[PDB]
Design a protein around this ligand. Structure first.
Ligand SMILES: O=c1ccn([C@@H]2O[C@H](COP(=O)(O)OP(=O)(O)O)[C@@H](O)[C@H]2O)c(=O)[nH]1
Ligand SMILES: O=c1ccn([C@@H]2O[C@H](COP(=O)(O)OP(=O)(O)O)[C@@H](O)[C@H]2O)c(=O)[nH]1
Ligand SMILES: *[C@@H]1O[C@H](CO)[C@@H](O)[C@H](O)[C@H]1NC(C)=O
Ligand SMILES: *[C@@H]1O[C@H](CO)[C@@H](O)[C@H](O)[C@H]1NC(C)=O
Ligand SMILES: *[C@@H]1O[C@H](CO)[C@@H](O)[C@H](O)[C@H]1NC(C)=O
Ligand SMILES: *[C@@H]1O[C@H](CO)[C@@H](O)[C@H](O)[C@H]1NC(C)=O
Ligand SMILES: *[C@@H]1O[C@H](CO)[C@@H](O)[C@H](O)[C@H]1NC(C)=O
Ligand SMILES: *[C@@H]1O[C@H](CO)[C@@H](O)[C@H](O)[C@H]1NC(C)=O
Ligand SMILES: *[C@@H]1O[C@H](CO)[C@@H](O)[C@H](O)[C@H]1NC(C)=O
Ligand SMILES: *[C@H]1O[C@H](CO)[C@@H](O)[C@H](O)[C@@H]1O
Lengths: 527, 521
């Protein structure tokens, strides 16, 4: 039994009225900024956060007019999206005399914007994963924070997933007008980290993977482990993730039997509509292979066990290489998932729906000349977000899957039985710097350059399959080097080494060809 | 407990491994929160242990060495102040000594130059103060770990005021144990409070985009004053040096200042006064006069409205060396700044026989010595030990009184020192921006005042309007006093115009643009 401590109202009102708002934020740009506020206020009538200047006020960063070029920070994880900015208006703390008495929020708050709470992929990629690790950026937040979703949408189809990310009930912006005309957070954090994102949806360039992905499969799976425990989720089979409303697999029944016979495994169907989400996660987490049309439901592939296979199907005229949010997820370093893409290339096996509304892929609202152009094109061109008619027209086709071509496409990657072979998922880490690098000239001989060094310190405690040392030889005063790949820690160079010459020697250790370590301090050596 | 050599801790470490979550896009603005980060005192390497609960955000791959994970000092991208770790599986602890655990939460950072007062305040104290306040619980509980490798330095007592717990230096970790393991540690310092760069790539000068204002400097100074028991008759304060860079006619300077401003004058120095007494003297000075030097960083303790008079030796252009000019003229600092330069060779004293440390030139080739002696202004240069710069900056100076008084009087007319201080805030967006269309084309626009202006009294309120024709990448600007306008000049029918509106307080406080107003004629 813990005390249900409320706010000490006279004390809080005095600290607010005399001291004012306090703000300390990270990062130097608005696209990578997280803010810690004390005594930040919000008027539910104006729908504006308020910074009150008092005698203890702090504003870091202090941007001046730059606070509106474009704003203070991104409230959502979609970078620089001009409808998801956060900012406040300023008033002197004395101006509280002209306002109703404030209502204080005792809970520590995390304020953020959900991008599209109706799409499972946006929920996981833009909100759930960023929230999970943003909370763990600051001590105490993970156990105490109440989420405040200010984007303006309702609960959405997946609100129960948002409730798993916090012990307290999250609040929407529309609910704040009932709490009071002037609300003041005693302790609030604002913003979401972009560190877990891997996709951009096509606002400035055609959609695709983020340029520099900073998340690995291990961090994805730690998040999945948490959600599975929250959902109370603790005969090998193939799982077909079905859709019931649009973008259908028209011969799903034939597909289930064909996969069952080809791989000699039980096949099972799952869908968002007919299964509770905890049951969906339960089925995915033990599946050896996940087969599904391109769509939001494939984001659940992050729950797949290591070693499982993802088979993504694409409708006619949809190039798999151009739409890769689930390919990128499946092939992240550390995810350890096989990825297979299959595209319908037979026009007799596709079903178009030109009469539907525009948001469902219809084209009847366009002029007859443009409809014929869309109908005659056999691949969606590269485009920008969000309502490209040809993209929607083709992505909401129904598909008859050519069974033998799908089987052969899978077999080029899954040569035998699918799923984990109970493999040893070794950790992949990098060497340290080589230590104590020394060098010597000849001991009337040729020109000789002999170099030696000690192994990296962490290699003292490592068992590694292949250890090599890349050595760069740069002659004094020249801008070019000669590379060497060596296995030993002691080498004497002779070929093309000149007498009475000084060389710059750079050394770095490499594990298994691809894991490059850092270079040590440069070694200067004369022959 | 400061140290501990708990089976729960060893098992959490051996099973789960290290946990890392960091902010920032690049290594130059990254702060990291670590759990179970470890350090080998023998190898002087931090260690990330890969366990079954390990997290590495960001996961940089090989890019973790281009050039490192983060900056350990607030000097940007300095190739000797990098932080990084080496990796091992958590099971490798079988072949390592029994770890000694640091139970207190830690903040790990590098001091750039703990022997220079300016470097102490600018690079370390201010960044430490606000980095601790970036994360809950740090300001009251953190133990500071300085890893740059220096000793205490002359100002180590100032670092102790930022923390109730005893700080530890890297050389002191060796005695703690061969393998040290932090249960909770933060790494890095924010650069948000910095305002100067010391000339590593381009010549030294102000930071390109300064993100700190005088209000944040003064909140930090207020905290330090209470830690020094400095509580809260007008006088002018001359901040003298006793070893080098002397004012040769100091006694006559004190008399001439006291007569010119009809005000008491008093001296102070770092050598002859306890630092708490130095702060007490500066905090009520109406004017601070001193040679260019580290002691002028104490100007951040001056009361609002006081004047800073910085004197420069012969051949030292004040415009090239502006760390204290930048500090004094920061927005919100409310300090007047005056620079005076000695331009008479008969009033300067050189010391060519001193070590390189103190500006001697006797260790150089005779041809280089002749160049330095014959040059009348120190050229622009990069860090760190330029001989001509050190030779002139350690000159002694006889201050020409009539020229200095005239220089001060161009900035300080009348009495120096403190006035009422309004904080300058910005307008909100204009609200409910509507428009009407019209022949000859006509376009009417109107809007409501920003919400915060409902509660403000402002001397001058104007509205800037950008008129952009849809399909053109340019605009026509207008400055209005009313909340409405009707455009007729160069307005066309069958055209779509985009209207951008922002409000401006007192000419210079530009507010944000509202959402674009699309009006078609
Ligand atoms: O037959 C369907 C079609 C869609 N959805 C879900 O409804 C949301 C919106 O679907 P949409 O097609 O707009 O998103 P997409 O799948 O193209 O990302 C997503 O969470 C889908 O998984 C569903 O459950 N069944
Ligand atoms: O006569 C002197 C000369 C220097 N210093 C202090 O000693 C440190 C190192 O001086 P240096 O000249 O290297 O720094 P500078 O003043 O040029 O920044 C600084 O904290 C100075 O304030 C001092 O107290 N008295
Ligand atoms: C602000 O006001 C409080 C209450 O009077 C006072 O204790 C404090 O010294 C003032 N100044 C600052 C910088 O907090
Ligand atoms: C799922 O089934 C059982 C546990 O329910 C487990 O033995 C099996 O390995 C799991 N599937 C995979 C692919 O690991
Ligand atoms: C190889 O061994 C050591 C390096 O550890 C070095 O002293 C020795 O001279 C090397 N051999 C040569 C340079 O022939
Ligand atoms: C890690 O190991 C602990 C103890 O062995 C166990 O409780 C936990 O489930 C494992 N997995 C994760 C993801 O922590
Ligand atoms: C100020 O006095 C208090 C004792 O109550 C203490 O914080 C500290 O030792 C003193 N500081 C100085 C500089 O005298
Ligand atoms: C502090 O400074 C004020 C401002 O000029 C002045 O009254 C005097 O120098 C000091 N007052 C004290 C110590 O009470
Ligand atoms: C235009 O704005 C002024 C104040 O700026 C106001 O007095 C006037 O009534 C407004 N006119 C219209 C037509 O709204
Ligand atoms: C809006 O646009 C996004 C990005 O293309 C889609 O993922 C979403 O389904 C909706 O079409």
């Amino acid at each position: 039994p813990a005390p249900a401590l409320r706010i000490d109202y006279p004390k809080a009102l005095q600290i607010l009225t005399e001291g004012g708002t306090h703000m300390v934020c990270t990062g130097r740009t608005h696209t990578d900024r997280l803010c810690r506020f004390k005594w930040l206020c919000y008027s539910s009538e104006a729908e504006e956060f308020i910074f009150f200047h008092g005698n203890a006020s702090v504003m870091l960063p202090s941007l001046g007019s730059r606070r509106f070029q474009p704003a203070l920070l991104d409230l959502s994880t979609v970078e620089d999206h001009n409808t998801q900015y956060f900012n406040f208006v300023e008033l002197p703390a004395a101006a509280l005399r002209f306002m109703p008495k404030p209502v204080f929020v005792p809970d520590v708050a995390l304020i953020a914007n959900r991008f599209n709470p109706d799409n499972l992929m946006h929920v996981f990629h833009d909100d759930l994963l960023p929230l999970f690790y943003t909370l763990r950026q600051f001590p105490g937040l993970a156990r105490e924070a109440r989420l405040f979703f200010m984007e303006g949408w309702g609960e959405g189809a997946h609100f129960d997933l948002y409730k798993l990310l916090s012990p307290k009930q999250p609040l929407l912006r529309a609910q704040l007008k009932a709490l009071g005309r002037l609300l003041c957070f005693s302790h609030a954090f604002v913003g979401l980290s972009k560190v877990t994102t891997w996709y951009q949806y096509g606002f400035v360039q055609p959609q695709g993977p983020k340029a520099n992905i900073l998340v690995s499969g291990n961090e994805i799976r730690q998040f999945a482990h948490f959600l599975m425990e929250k959902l109370n989720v603790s005969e090998e089979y193939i799982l077909v993730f079905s859709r019931t409303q649009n973008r259908l697999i028209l011969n799903e029944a034939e597909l289930l039997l064909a996969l069952a016979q080809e791989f000699q495994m039980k096949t099972v169907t799952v869908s968002l509509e007919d299964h509770a989400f905890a049951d969906v996660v339960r089925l995915v987490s033990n599946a050896s292979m996940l087969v599904s049309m391109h769509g939001a439901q494939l984001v659940t592939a992050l729950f797949l066990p290591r070693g499982a296979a993802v088979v993504e199907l694409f409708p006619y005229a949809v190039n798999p290489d151009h739409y890769t949010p689930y390919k990128t997820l499946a092939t992240l370093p550390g995810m350890d998932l096989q990825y297979i893409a299959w595209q319908n290339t037979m026009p007799e096996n596709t079903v178009t729906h030109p009469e539907r509304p525009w948001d469902q892929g219809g084209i009847a609202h366009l002029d007859r000349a443009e409809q014929a152009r869309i109908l005659q094109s056999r691949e969606v061109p590269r485009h920008l977000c969000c309502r490209n008619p040809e993209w929607l027209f083709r992505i909401y086709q129904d598909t008859k899957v050519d069974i033998p071509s799908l089987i052969q496409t899978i077999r080029r990657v899954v040569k035998g039985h699918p799923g984990p072979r109970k493999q040893k998922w070794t950790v992949s880490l990098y060497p340290g710097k080589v230590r104590e690098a020394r060098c010597q000239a000849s001991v009337a001989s040729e020109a000789r350059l002999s170099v030696s060094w000690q192994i990296p310190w962490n290699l003292k405690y490592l068992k590694v399959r292949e250890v090599k040392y890349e050595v760069w030889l740069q002659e004094q005063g020249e801008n070019t080097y000669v590379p060497y790949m060596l296995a030993l820690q002691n080498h004497t160079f002779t070929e093309n080494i000149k007498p009475f010459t000084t060389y710059l020697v750079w050394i770095r250790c490499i594990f298994n060809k691809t894991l490059l370590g850092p270079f040590a301090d440069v070694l200067v050596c004369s022959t």
